[PDB]
Amino acid sequence: PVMEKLRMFVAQEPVVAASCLIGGVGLFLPAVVRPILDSLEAS
Amino acid sequence: MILSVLSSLALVSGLMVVRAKNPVHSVLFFILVFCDTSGLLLLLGLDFFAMIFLVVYIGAIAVLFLFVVMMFHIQIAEIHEEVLRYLPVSGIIGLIFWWEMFFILDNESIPLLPTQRNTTSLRYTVYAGKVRSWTNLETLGNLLYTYYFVWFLVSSLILLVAMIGAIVLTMHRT
Amino acid sequence: MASGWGITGNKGRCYDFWMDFSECMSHCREPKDCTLLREDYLECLHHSKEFQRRNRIYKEEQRKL
Amino acid sequence: GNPIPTSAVLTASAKHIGMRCMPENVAFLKCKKNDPNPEKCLDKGRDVTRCVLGLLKDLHQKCQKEMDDYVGCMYYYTNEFDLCRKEQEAFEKVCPLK
Amino acid sequence: PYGFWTFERHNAQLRWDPQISQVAGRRDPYDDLLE
Amino acid sequence: ALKEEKYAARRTILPILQAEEDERFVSEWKKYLEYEADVMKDVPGWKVGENVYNSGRWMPPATGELRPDVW
Amino acid sequence: MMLEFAPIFIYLVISLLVSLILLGVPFLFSRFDIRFYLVSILFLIFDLEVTFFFPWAVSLNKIDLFGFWSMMAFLFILTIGFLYEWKRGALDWE
Amino acid sequence: MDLIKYFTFSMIIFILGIWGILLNRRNILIMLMSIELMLLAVNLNFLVFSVSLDDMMGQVFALLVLTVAAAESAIGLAIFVITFRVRGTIAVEFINSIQG
Amino acid sequence: MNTDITALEKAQYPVVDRNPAFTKVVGNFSTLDYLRFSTITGISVTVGYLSGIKPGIKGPSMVTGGLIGLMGGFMYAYQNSAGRLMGFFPNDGEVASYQKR
Amino acid sequence: LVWLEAMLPLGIIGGMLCIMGNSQYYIHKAYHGRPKHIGHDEWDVAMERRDKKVVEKA
Amino acid sequence: YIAVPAEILGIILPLLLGVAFLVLAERKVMAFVQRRKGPDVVGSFGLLQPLADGLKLILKEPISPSSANFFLFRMAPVATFMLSLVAWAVVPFDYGMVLSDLNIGLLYLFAISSLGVYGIIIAGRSSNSKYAFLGALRSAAQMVSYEVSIGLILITVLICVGSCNLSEIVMAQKQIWFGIPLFPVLVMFFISCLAETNRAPFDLPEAEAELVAGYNVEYSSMGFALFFLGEYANMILMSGLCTLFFLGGWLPILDLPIFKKIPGSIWFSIKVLFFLFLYIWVRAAFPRYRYDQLMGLGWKVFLPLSLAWVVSVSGLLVTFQWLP
DSSP states (O other), rough: TTTTTHHHHHHHHHHHHHHHHHHHHHHHIIIHHHHHHHHHHOO | HHHHHHHHHHHHHHHHHHHHHHHHHHHHHHHHHHHOOOOHHHTTHHHHHEEEEEEIIIIHHHHHHHHHHHHHHHHHHHOOOGGGGGGHHHHHHHHHHHHHHSSHHHSSOOOOEEEEEEOGGOOOOOOGGSSSSOOOHHHHHHHHTTTTTHHHHHHHHHHHHHHHHHHHHHHHOO | OOOOOOOTTOOOOTHHEEEEEEEEHHOOOSGGGHHHHHHHHHHHHHHHHHHHHHHHHHHHHHEEE | OOOOOHHHHHTHHHHHHHHHHHHHHHHHHHHHHHOSSSGGGGGHHHHHHHHHHHHHHHHHHHHHHHHHHHHHHHHHHTSGGGGGHHHHHHHHHHHHOO | OTTTTSSSGGGGHHHHHGGTTTTOOOTEEEEEEOO | HHHHHHHHHHHSSSHHHHHHHHHHHHHHHHHHHHHHHHHHTTOOTTOOOOOOTOOOOOOOHHHHHHHHGOO | OOOOGHHHHHHHHHHHHHHHHHHHHHTTTOOOOHHHHHHHHHHHHHHHHHHHHHHHHHHHHHHHHHHHHHHHHHHHHHHHHHHHHHTTTTTTTO | OOOHHHHHHHHHHHHHHHHHHHHHHHOOHHHHHHHHHHHHHHHHHHHHHHHHHHHHHHHHHHHHHHHHHHHHHHHHHHHHHHHHHHHHHHOGGGGGOSOO | OOOOOOOSSSSSSSOOOOOOOOHHHHHTTOOOHHHHHHHHHHHHHHHHHHHHHHTTOOOHHHHHHHHHHHHHHHHHHHHHHHHHHHSSSOOOOHHHHHTTT | OTTTHHHHHHHHHHHHHHHHHEEEEEEOOOOOOOSTTTOOHHHHHHHHHHHHHHHHHH | SHHHHHHHHHHHHHHHHHHHHHHHHHHHHHHHHHOOOOSOOGGGGGGHHHHHHHHHHHHHHOOOOSSSTTTHHHHHHHHHHHHHHHHGGOSSSBTTTSSOOOHHHHHHHHHHHTTHHHHHHHHHHHTOOOHHHHHHHHHHHHHHHHHHHHHHHHHHHHHHHHOOOOOHHHHHHHSTTTTTTHHHHHHHHHHHHHHTTOOOTTOOOGGGTTTTTTTSSSOOOHHHHHHHHHHHHHHHHHHHHHHHHHHHHTTOSOOOOOOOOHHHHHHHHHHHHHHHHHHHHHHOOOOOOOOOHHHHHHHIIHHHHHHHHHHHHHHHHHHHHOOO
């Protein structure tokens, strides 16, 4: 049941969770969004 | 002249690194040798390396040396020895290395003797290179992460080994 | 200066000489065929012969004085 | 009569010099690309110099006050365009780039 | 052998450097003025 | 855009500045060549203004200062 | 240009003179703690990380996506090191 | 004469490292610092040559050698700490058991 | 970033596609490729389980071994598929599908 | 209104900072005849060195 | 170059006066929060109190304990004082108002920050007191720990600007101040500056009542004064960096002709004054952390957040091609 384990992990360690989220958005945007924009520009 | 002043400061400070009785003083004279090196780099126009020698050698490496040496409280008896007897061997080794290496460039890089004529008037200026000039920082950053990125990553592996080995060798968890 | 990357962000001072020497050596099966280009590259690197000649001029000036 | 071609004058007139002396500039740059020797381009250089000096004289005669003000501002601010907008606009109103 | 330098494995720079000959950081300065 | 404006301005006045510098260097090199011919007169085998490069391609005279442009 | 560093040197000399005047006018009238070694090591590693970021941050507009991802791989290796240090209690001072 | 003067600056630092090895047979911490002086001299060589040749490869390598020097110092001092912790002293007479 | 796929040693088989895309190489996975993938993954899961018994972590060790095996088997299958598409490995089926589509 | 007493040492610090800027700005301008230019690069240095000749030799 | 000393003095002397009066302003604002008056007898509104304390300090006899490190003991406060002074050569107060227009000024500031630890370390060791030495080691550790976060935040700003020139960093905030999108970065930067200047709630050297003797416990007379003056000059500097990096330096709040009537040095001074008020307001508001707690905060909270913000800002700017 790994859904409240994430909830507890956020409750115990909010700074780690926030760092992972902020950095994860920073990694997600160039990985996923940027090729979408490059493709949308090609057509 | 200026290069002579910096060379003399570095020479005295290095002698004091290798000859000070107290190792704390040795680490402090080492900081002076790094400051002098930073000055030389500023003369060569490499201001990024001049700042990084301050940040890394003095700001981080010398600090680690100082922390370790200070907490060790070395006693002068455990490390003392008279060095008069090494003057001959130092003389021969240093003289061989001097005569051979202080003059290694002389055959290949012959110095231009300064004449009593203004040679500055023959400096040719090419303005095309000066329209958008690059700093040392961006010139290095243009190469580190693209054309030579593998060596960058191998250096990261070297740093990882340092972190692991530091923990494994010294950690005693409370 | 064989890489091409200059320290101010342009082609290195001695890259063209290097490339001439390399292109000569790529098809000349004897290294002696590219000796002139090789010493051109090394002259660019160290300015040995130029400075030697200018020192000759300076020496002659000192001798005639 | 003819303005001194200082960095202030040349920079303040650079837009006109680009819109007007494009061919001589291009020829000079092309032959510089072919041969870096200064002696082997003195002719193409003289065509650039005559272009620019003729255009500079034209600007002074065609608009003296507004060019003076612009050049003075550009010298004062060491050729920073953002600090000299009013004088650039005034100078361009009277001597259009066209 | 006779002229190892002559072999194609030994001429990698001569074929790769032209492909980066237009890259910022290694151009002839006049290239920006004409292009 | 601001930086591009300033770089445009520098590009258009580039040719006249380079032509001025070329004239200056040519005149100075002529003067130095006369000086060299004068001093090196009576020395057999000398060739005034000989190109040390076998290819003969023109290079600016070397200065013997490591980084003179930055100061 | 390196011209702008000379005022820093003259500034240093003047600061020295002021220091000595202030300090001189009154002369007229055995227990090794490994946790300091460990913090030194951590600081050194991240000092080198800041050092490698300086050229990257100014060069991002030219290196584009390749440079971004090579720096990300670098960070990933060093952050694995950081997680190792964290789990081993090198970040705890109690 | 610029290149020779910078070169001799770096060369004197290298020789000082060699002498510091030669002169500190009871002081192994100073030996580690002498090795760091040699490494600094080499880095200077690379930077000076990079300038003299108008080539960037000397600067790339100087930065990487910086990383290596930092790693070497961290590991070296860790080994020094565990050597001292085991023996209680840094005297060279307590680190000479292995021989023959 | 300028690139060049050209290899030192030329492909000895019909070059179906010089630089096949990632998804194209994945879609080129054959029965033998999946057999290699599955064998590597299963061996790795098994080694993880067996080596995890003594420390008492056979399940987590199984997951770790399975991850190592998944990455290694996928890399091996990709290697083979891309080599076939590029003509470096015998690629009869690739050529038969290419000459028809 | 007693709290204005606290605003005096702060205003004196702010004035000290304004002096640290403006006094050095006006001394450089008097010595060079124009304000200091931010971003003096190799081009500007070369322009000044050439302008010396173009002015003095005119 | 003959007028360069005039410029340097016009920077250094008013800075020493501004520090003298920062001490006064700290004593006044803390007093008012505590319903007290603060120094108001020595001069009108207490305005001559700095002069009196400085003259008292220079008239005090120096002590100079019988240590084997006579020279280093006196040199350590000189070292820290010099380091605090020399950072101002690259600080721009307004457009064109700066002593040295360094293209590498950001890295230079980081290097000075990194050098600041040696004065404290050396003072602690040279004092021949185990209390001073232990306090010094803890303070040095705290400073280097928070320098990591300071440096990673510097990298975030550099990514936005694309240049290490401090004037360029200011002028890149004409569209918008960097403290608006990066407000969490500004918060973490202000906290990391409190911990780097050894200020409350991170002031270990002040916790003598807590059985923690500070690195400057043995110092008297003017060496003690030089340590104190270096620390306070560092607080004005860190308030100036907060202003330059995130509050747009000398720029006005709004690009409007009414706001452009007052000069840029006034804007810069007012923002610096806001940050100095907050340094004092925090001292007056909260208790202090223990050493282990603030060390945990440094490594486990501020390093990860700073690193994550570097990644997020660089990735967002690379994705949409908003890079400088």
